[PDB]
């Protein structure tokens, strides 16, 4: 029952690569962020389709290109925070109230393609980079907890990653066609996170030492045959896509194999379904899910939206809805649902923004 109620276009006329509703709220009007050009912009959704422009953060570098953003809580205030990053490879932590950049993190050797916050710890930020590595940061103490990468790490750009429900493991994916599992609930990694919270550089002389994780706990190149540019956990299953007009639902190992008994040598995968669509041949096209993971939405390169209902007994039984508008014809780079699932926003290569209300 989604209906398109409004649209608009940002003044820079550059691609909007990312959009995220803030779910780290009190509910408080529904706010979302868009990222494109060298800026991030906040909007507030109101009655009768109204999309109210708030305030932007514009990078001082006119050559910066923001690709991705992610929301969390400020653990010192309970107000939200917004992390943004892109081609410069610099993470900026933004106070969304004032749009001030309150701190930034340098380190990645190239562009940052995705940011994700831990599902249970609002201070733990994951970044994935063109430099072939992932990094885990603690934004409360400004520490680098771990770097995931090496010869057995990704061999090309990492494009996407996702924490599982518990925040016990990460699945990453990228241009080397592979999906890789990184467990972060080992005794060593839990101890390193504890140490990151104990670290105060004014109280000690040591720098904070990061964990160097060179080997994934599972890896496969048998799901897709091209760049893998979006991945999400669905319980113990994985949803991932490449630029081959399909989202694949799969799991490591054989059908009855538990995800936590999977060993790094595991050679098998099981495919539980595949959701096909059309005209999504370019890479860097991301799907999103609602808060409950009842729904999945993906835009294609000519402005069509696909929305799958996952509230069915098995993944391959997902029910698909399509959403089209005769004036929406540019590539849709990302979608986002409001926390109450009542609004769906899509953002486009022509800097346009589309609001769909349930």
């Amino acid at each position: 029952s989604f209906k398109c109620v409004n649209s608009l276009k940002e003044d820079h006329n550059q691609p909007l690569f990312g959009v995220q509703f803030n779910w780290h709220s009190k509910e408080d009007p529904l706010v979302f962020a868009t990222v494109g050009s060298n800026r991030v912009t906040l909007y507030e959704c109101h009655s009768q389709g109204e999309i109210r422009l708030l305030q932007s953060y514009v990078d001082a570098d006119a050559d910066e290109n923001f690709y991705t953003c992610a929301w969390t809580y400020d653990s010192n205030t309970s107000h939200p925070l917004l992390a943004v990053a892109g081609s410069r490879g610099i993470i900026r932590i933004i106070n969304p109230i004032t749009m001030q950049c309150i701190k930034h993190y340098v380190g990645h050797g190239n562009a940052i393609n995705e940011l994700k916050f831990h599902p249970r710890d609002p201070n733990l930020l994951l970044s994935v980079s063109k430099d072939h590595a992932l990094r885990l940061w603690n934004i409360q103490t400004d520490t680098l907890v771990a770097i995931f990468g090496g010869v057995e790490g990704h061999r090309d750009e990492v494009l996407s990653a996702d924490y599982d429900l518990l925040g016990e493991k990460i699945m990453s994916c990228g241009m080397d066609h592979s999906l890789k599992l990184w467990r972060i609930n080992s005794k060593r990694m839990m101890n390193a996170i504890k140490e990151s919270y104990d670290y105060n550089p004014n109280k000690t002389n040591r720098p904070f030492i990061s964990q160097k994780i060179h080997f994934p706990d599972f890896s496969t190149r048998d799901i897709h045959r091209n760049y893998v540019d979006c991945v999400r956990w669905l319980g113990d299953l994985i949803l991932s896509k490449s630029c081959e007009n399909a989202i694949v639902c799969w799991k490591p190992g054989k059908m009855e194999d538990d995800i936590d008994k999977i060993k790094p040598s595991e050679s098998n995968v099981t495919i539980l379904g595949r959701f096909d669509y059309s005209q999504c041949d370019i890479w860097y096209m991301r799907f999103s899910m609602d808060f409950w993971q009842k729904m999945l939405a993906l835009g294609n390169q000519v402005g069509k939206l696909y929305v799958w209902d996952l509230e069915v007994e098995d993944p391959h039984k997902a029910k698909c809805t399509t959403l089209t508008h005769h004036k929406c014809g540019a590539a849709i780079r990302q979608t986002s649902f409001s926390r109450d699932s009542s609004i769906l926003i899509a953002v486009c290569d022509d800097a346009s923004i589309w609001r769909w209300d349930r």
Binding site: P15, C243, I282, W283, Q301, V302, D349
Partner: peptide, 5 residues
């Protein structure tokens, strides 16, 4: 592949 159509 291409990033853009």
């Amino acid at each position: 592949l291409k990033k853009f159509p």
